[PDB]
RNA sequence: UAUCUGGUUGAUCCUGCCAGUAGUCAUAUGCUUGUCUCAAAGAUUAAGCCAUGCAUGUCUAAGUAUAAGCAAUUUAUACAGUGAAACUGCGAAUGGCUCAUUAAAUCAGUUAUCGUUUAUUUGAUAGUAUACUUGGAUAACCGUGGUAAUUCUAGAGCUAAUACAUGCUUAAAAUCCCGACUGUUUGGAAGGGAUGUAUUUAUUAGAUAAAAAUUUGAUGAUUCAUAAUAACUUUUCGAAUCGCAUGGCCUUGUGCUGGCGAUGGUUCAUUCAAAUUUCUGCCCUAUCAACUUUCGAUGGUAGGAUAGUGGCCUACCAUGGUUUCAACGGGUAACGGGGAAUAAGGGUUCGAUUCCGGAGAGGGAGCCUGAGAAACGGCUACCACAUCCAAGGAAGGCAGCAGGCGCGCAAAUUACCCAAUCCCGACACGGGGAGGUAGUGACAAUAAAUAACGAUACAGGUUGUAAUUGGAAUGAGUACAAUGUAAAUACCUUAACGAGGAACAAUUGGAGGGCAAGUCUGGUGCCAGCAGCCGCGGUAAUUCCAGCUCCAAAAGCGUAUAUUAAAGUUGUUGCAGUUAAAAAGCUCGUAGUUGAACCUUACUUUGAAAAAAUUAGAGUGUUCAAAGCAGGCCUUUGCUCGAAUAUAUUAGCAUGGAAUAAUAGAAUAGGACGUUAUGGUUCU
RNA sequence: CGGCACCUUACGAGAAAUCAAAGUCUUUGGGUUCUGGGGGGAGUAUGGUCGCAAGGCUGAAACUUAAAGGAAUUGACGGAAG
RNA sequence: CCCGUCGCUACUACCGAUUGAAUGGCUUAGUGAGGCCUCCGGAUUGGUUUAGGGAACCGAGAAGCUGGUCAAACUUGGUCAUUUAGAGGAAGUAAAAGUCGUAACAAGGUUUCCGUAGGUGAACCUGCGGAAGGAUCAU
RNA sequence: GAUAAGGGAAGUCGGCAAAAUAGAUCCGUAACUUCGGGAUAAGGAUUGGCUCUAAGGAUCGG
């Protein structure tokens, strides 16, 4: 079983640490969810202490918040376009935190009226933890940096 | 190892229970409850080893299963119930009321009190913080949570709980000159007044306490329990000896004169 | 498991097994006090050696020390109580001057013999072993029972002993019943 | 008791070892063994292998009862008492065993969680915008079975829940959004939606240096507690449960209301815990000097994963990290520690083993359930062993208790019991090889028999005996009996029996020196043998083999090994180096150590801390003692001292002192004060 | 003042020979480096390392043994002197 | 008194062809059980449940399947460590004092010893340079 | 000039003849040594097509 313990590693001085004890359940690990875009499908996992986690295998819509107006609406997302960790996630449309996605602009447009059809977002939720792809809308210098990176 | 322990070896039991070495292999492991494991007294030890009303564990279990023993105004049938500091145990069948207060020798004295005094108890305020719906509450030393406290109440104060409604009768502010009992360390059971409090940010605050015999000692703030508004005015009856520490030679002289 | 029960040795043997001066002093002292063997002398020397060690430890400490005063007074009081040390030598300097014959003076065998209940010291030992002598109202059949000063006046024959008002023994009852 | 003595020489003084000597909670073994108390015991070699049996189950008035179980007719024709079987709940992750691995790993003291999970116990905490109370399965059960074989189960017919899946019942306001109409100086509004609690985002409170031109908690510290706004959610749960009593109001209804309890439930706190974590400290080895980084090694950014921090993992990017102050590697006949032996002091050796922490269940690995396991008296798989078979197949894990084989120098009964100590369960009641009791037990420890007293006869200096003459005493043993105990055994008491060679018989080693005690008698004749060492023995052997006598310790004495003292022969205290062993051939030199005088720390005092057990030590007539933590009072329908205390010691914490020993300061002044010095630039 | 030494004494040291240091060391501590732990086996074997080689530096164990050795005394002996 | 070859006997260790052997640990590579996650899959089995013959369409859901992850075990290779065989070679020690001599101790009959290099049955001899621990503290 | 079941040098004076290996990238590499070598030692892994990604430059403009 995948574990997090530092026993398997070697010391800072380089010494190969010997075999102390067998692997323990209280340090295990599990596989990445690799959230995709598709009909909302979540699996609940039995964690330590009786808590429950929700793998977001694939999702379609999540709530996104416009920081300038303090408005949060549930809206569709097109796909991920920029990921600081790995470009394979951008290529394969894997939804993780700190990943730039494009969202449907219809609810924000309709709220603006009442008060290119796709807006940029940064997912702040952790889909492999909660099962929701919730994020905010880029504005200002964050927007400028991500757009420079996208256009190049 | 794989989960919580449920046994207590006799040799590993707290020394203030005063259990004998050869009476068996194990000692009563106190249950979870209002008081910490190391600072409590299980009712089997109190009712059998101290008062000697019961001669053995079958009898302490028969006693408690007949609904005789009450701790802090509620009937307990758990033979390993963790009775602790300042708790009131009432046995109205024998018409006896006890209060668990440390004597100056470090042990829990057998201190009988009247029913009127057995109608309340004191608790040291450990923390003040906000509960759900923004309602402040106070946690005392026996794990009690009292809602809607006096807005003047802060940490390290002592409140007097009515013990029948669970409400706060009145409180004592932590300040210089207050009467204090020490609830930890080698000064366990001693009573004195605060002379000067020495603070150490990021560490442990130290309290200087003066005995009734003008003996001065220093102890950690976590071991200080305020029991009175001034010298000679405790809010509970003190055990026999009045918390005055005598040297071993003085104790030897006193025992010699008392016994002839 | 259960807690261990403490035990300790009550004697120590000499380093040189064969030494005519020590062998003769021990044998002469055993003959004087009617002892069974040398281990009873090793026992006396051991307990006096640790009384001396305690006194030496207190004497190296400064005078008026609270600990020196407390344990020294307790040790002196115990020695006067058990009759080994005289009432005029309560100074913790005469304890070091104490000698094994002082302890051997206070044995039950010695006190019975010096009280006349026996013809000789060996008669004293056999009288003790045969359950004839009682101290107070309690029969003691241990010859090494160290008699305290307050127990000294209450040494006499057991009330149910043939020599102390009891019935005739096996031999006498067998003789007079024929 | 801070101790020495024999052996090199013709003789001497030395160095120096060999030998002697004593202990061992230190093992084996030989001979011997009467009593009381106490008590270790298959660790060492093989973490080698296991037949058999047991060691974990559990119900209260209070989950589910149509047993075609028992019992009686009774306040009862829905059941109602007791109560198997099953379903449900909880426990089975405790205990017990062992010490293979393991050398910054475990562990010890000291820290942290503002870095997390937490069944249970104990406190608080929830009116949230068909109801006289919802469904359909299933067990046990009945009767059809298949296999040689297992705690294997399949069809068919039932039936229940605090099991499974669903669902209303309710205060009073108040607030917010959308908003037809309306007022029309910016207000009023019908009608629609939303309010509790959980989840996930985003954004705001969450203040607090003193005069002139209304609220706001805690901390050393937070983006903490908590609140608000906009939304979100295969929408968390805000009791469709169970026992006893049956009361109150009459507008004569199976009307409306309600008392003590079981169990359950969200969140917060508490407790029992867990997991990471700071500082300092581990044995031998250099014939181990460089190690770590492919394929994570050190760090940065982002993510994933986790209960959470963290290269724990991934992607990208830097080249870092440890080391002669010993890194890395190797060895360990190495679990760490509390502690044990010996010891003037300092030390040396040991610690498998009664307690704490860790790890494991033949070796690995992977997991389910659960709050908690990488569990093995749970499962899956491989390797090695190993059981039945009808050869189609099936079942294992004693380093638990007892027991068997092997291994060996080395270690006991396949016994009785839950009575005590405690633990588990729905529990006053069941269970517990945990534990207690007895058996074997010269591992060690305590006390302590094997005789005592007269008279003669002699010897003898008023009395010690050597012999033959007496009357007394007694327990070892045997036993009525009582006590003891769950029942016994044993102990303690106690009728009757029980001693003259009181045969109811004390042994083990020795007698040249070391070393205490023969130059006695017989045997052999450099043989046999003894002898730790020196030596003895070749025809009067103080030394061999025996008899006599004697010496030492004695229910114990001898032998082997290891270790400690002796050993100032491991020397810091405290060795030696011209010639006994030993100054590098001679200089330079880095780390290390040490450093003339003078006006930030280290050091030292005190406090807190260092678990219990152990040690020392106070008290206390277990008949004494080893021990134990008891006990004592004129005899008590109760009175009443106690169970001290020291010591721990490196590291960390607080404190007083400023010698001793370091460290910093004003030389291109880049120096100090102006407290209310004069102006200028800013910030709150 | 610095050197190379020497002569006498022994307060003192040492087992002694002897020593102005080999003294100021059981009345034991000025600073510092190296080496030895009975005699042999043995500076051997093995591994490493330096050297063209000879060899150098580092460096055991099995086994065996009660002495080996230091200074001095008396004697005996000397193909040593008087 | 004493040294050493050589001969006999016994014991210990070393070197040694045998690409010697055996046992245990770590590991590259290959094969790879099993569990877990994921992806479809959909035996049968209830109805959101609708239908005058019944046509549907919703949920649960077994086997199985795809791709990953942790990874036992076996084969090969490497390496470390510990035991062990070996023709022969060269030593050491003990026993007895067997053969040959007399190297050392006296000026030991050539003073001895140290380093080095040759030679020789053996002790040893010789060269060169040192030392006195010399047989001289001296002309 | 090719191929061949099972065995794999038993054929023969003799592995004669044939077979096997083979490029490149990456890993790993012994005795011995004249220190230069031995060495391509030995022994392993990968390799197509397609769709992408990243890195590596020149000339002008202050």
What are the DSSP calls for A83-144, one per residue?
Answer: -SS-HHHHHHT---TT-EEEEE-HHHHHHHHH---EEEEEE-S-HHHHS---EEE--THHHH
Q: Which of C157, C126, C144 has the alpha carbon at shortest distance from C82? A: C144
Instruction: Give long-range contacts, CB 8 A cutoff, 24+ apart: B46-55.
Output: B46/B83, B46/B89, B46/B100, B46/B108, B49/B17, B49/B18, B49/B19, B50/B108, B50/B110, B51/B110, B53/B94
Query: Which secondary structure element, helix H or strand E, spans residue C97, and what is its range?
Result: none
β-pairing, A118-123 vs A135-137, is antiparallel
Q: Which two tokens stand for residue B97?
A: 């009321």
CA distance B136 to B132: 8
Q: Which two tokens stand for residue B92?
A: 């109205």
Contact by Cβ (8 Å): B135, B121: no
β-pairing, B158-161 vs B206-211, is unpaired
Q: Which of A41, A39, A43 has the alpha carbon at shortest distance from A54? A: A43
Estimate to the nearest angstrom the gap between the alpha carbon of B119 and the chain centroid: 16
Backbone angles phi, psi at B77, to 5 degrees: -115, 10
Q: Which two tokens stand for residue A141?
A: 């210098």
**Inter-chain CB proximity B22 and C70 less than 8 Å:** no
Burial track A97-122 (b if 16+ CB lie within 10 A, e otherwise): bebbbbbbbebbeeeeeeeeeebbbb
**What single-letter DSSP state applies at residue A25?**
G
Contact residues, chain C, for B252 at CB < 8 Å? 70, 74
Q: Which of C95, C49, C88 has the alpha carbon at shortest distance from C72? A: C95
CA distance A138 to A144: 9
Cβ neighbours for B149, distance < 8 A, ≥ 6 positions apart: B128, B136, B137, B138, B159, B168
Resolution (A): 3.1
Q: How far is the CA of B73 from the C1' of D248 (A)?
A: 30
Q: Which of B85, B153, B72 has the alpha carbon at shortest distance from B120? A: B72
Q: Please, what is the angle between helix C39-60 and helix C20-33, to 10°? A: 100
**Inter-chain CB proximity B249 and C70 less than 8 Å:** yes
Tell if A86 CB is < 7 Å from nucleic strand G.
no
Q: Please, what is the angle between helix B248-259 and helix C66-81, to 10°? A: 30
Q: How far is CA A73 from CA A67, B97, B196, in A?
A: 12, 65, 60
Looking up tokens 């303090």, which residue turns up? A70
How many angstroms away from the CA of B13 is the closest CA of chain C?
12
HEC profile of B79-97: CCCEEECCCEEEECCCCEE
β-pairing, A61-66 vs A135-137, is parallel
β-pairing, B40-42 vs C138-139, is unpaired
Query: Which secondary structure element, helix H or strand E, spans residue A2, and what is its range?
Result: none
From chain B residues 201-260, the ones with a CB under 8 A of any chain C CB are 247-249, 252
Contact by Cβ (8 Å): C158, C70: no
From chain C residues 96-155, the ones with a CB under 8 A of any chain B CB are none
Q: How far is the CA of B234 from the C1' of D124 (A)?
A: 29
Q: Which two tokens stand for residue B201?
A: 């940010």
Cβ neighbours for B34, distance < 8 A, ≥ 6 positions apart: B82, B84, B87, B142, B143, B144
Cβ neighbours for A97, distance < 8 A, ≥ 6 positions apart: A123, A124, A125, A126, A127
């Amino acid at each position: 079983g995948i574990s997090r313990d530092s026993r398997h590693k070697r010391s800072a001085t380089g010494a190969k640490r010997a075999q102390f004890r067998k692997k323990r359940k209280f340090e295990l690990g599990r596989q990445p969810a690799n959230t995709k875009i598709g009909p909302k499908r979540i699996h609940s996992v039995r964690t330590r202490g009786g808590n429950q986690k929700f793998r977001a295998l694939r999702v379609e819509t999540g709530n996104f918040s416009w920081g300038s107006e303090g408005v949060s609406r549930k809206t569709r997302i097109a796909g991920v376009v920029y990921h600081p960790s790995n470009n394979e996630l951008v290529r394969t449309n894997t939804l993780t935190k700190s990943a730039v996605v494009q969202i449907d602009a219809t609810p924000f447009r309709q709220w603006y009226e009442n008060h290119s059809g796709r807006l940029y977002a940064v997912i702040s939720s952790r889909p492999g933890q909660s099962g929701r792809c919730d994020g905010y809308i880029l504005e200002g210098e964050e927007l400028a940096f991500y757009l420079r990176r996208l256009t190049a | 190892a794989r989960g919580p322990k449920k046994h207590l070896k006799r040799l590993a039991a707290p020394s203030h229970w005063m259990l004998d070495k050869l009476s068996g292999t194990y000692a009563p492991r106190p249950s979870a409850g209002p008081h910490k494991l190391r600072e409590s007294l299980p009712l089997v030890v109190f009712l059998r080893n101290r008062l000697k009303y019961a001669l053995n564990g079958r009898e302490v279990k028969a006693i408690m299963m007949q609904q005789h023993v009450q701790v802090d105004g509620k009937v307990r049938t758990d033979t390993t119930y963790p009775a602790g500091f300042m708790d009131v145990i009432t046995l109205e069948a024998t018409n006896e009321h006890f209060r668990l207060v440390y004597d100056v020798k470090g042990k829990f004295a057998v201190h009988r009190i009247s029913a009127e005094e057995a109608a309340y108890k004191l608790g040291k305020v450990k923390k003040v913080q906000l509960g759900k719906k923004g309602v402040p509450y106070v946690v005392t030393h026996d794990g009690r949570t009292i809602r809607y406290p006096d807005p003047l109440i802060r940490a390290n104060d002592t409140v007097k709980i009515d013990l029948a409604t669970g409400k706060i009768d009145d409180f004592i502010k932590f300040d210089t000159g207050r009467l204090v009992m020490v609830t930890g360390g080698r000064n366990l059971g001693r009573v004195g007044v605060i002379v000067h409090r020495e603070k150490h940010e990021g560490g442990f605050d130290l309290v200087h306490i003066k005995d009734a015999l003008e003996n001065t000692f220093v102890t950690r703030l976590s071991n200080v329990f305020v029991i009175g508004t001034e010298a000679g005015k405790p809010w509970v009856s003190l055990p026999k000896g009045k918390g005055i520490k005598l040297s071993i030679s003085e104790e030897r002289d006193r025992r010699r004169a008392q016994q002839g | 498991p259960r807690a261990p029960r403490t035990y300790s040795k009550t004697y120590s043997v000499p380093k040189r097994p064969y030494e005519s001066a020590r062998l003769d002093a021990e044998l002469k002292l055993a003959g004087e006090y009617g002892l069974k063997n040398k281990r009873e002398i090793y026992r006396i020397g051991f307990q006096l050696s640790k009384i001396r060690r305690a006194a030496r430890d207190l004497l190296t400490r400064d005078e008026k020390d609270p600990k020196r005063l407390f344990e020294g007074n307790a040790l002196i009081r115990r020695l006067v109580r058990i009759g080994v040390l005289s009432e005029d030598k309560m100074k913790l300097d005469y304890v070091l001057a104490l000698k094994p014959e002082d302890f051997l003076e206070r044995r039950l065998q010695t006190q019975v013999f010096k009280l006349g209940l026996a013809r000789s010291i060996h008669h004293a030992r056999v009288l003790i072993t045969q359950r004839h002598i009682a101290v107070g109202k309690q029969i003691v059949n241990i010859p090494s029972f160290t008699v305290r000063l307050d127990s000294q006046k209450h040494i006499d024959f057991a009330h149910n002993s043939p020599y102390g008002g009891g019935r005739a023994g096996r031999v006498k009852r067998k003789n007079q019943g024929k």
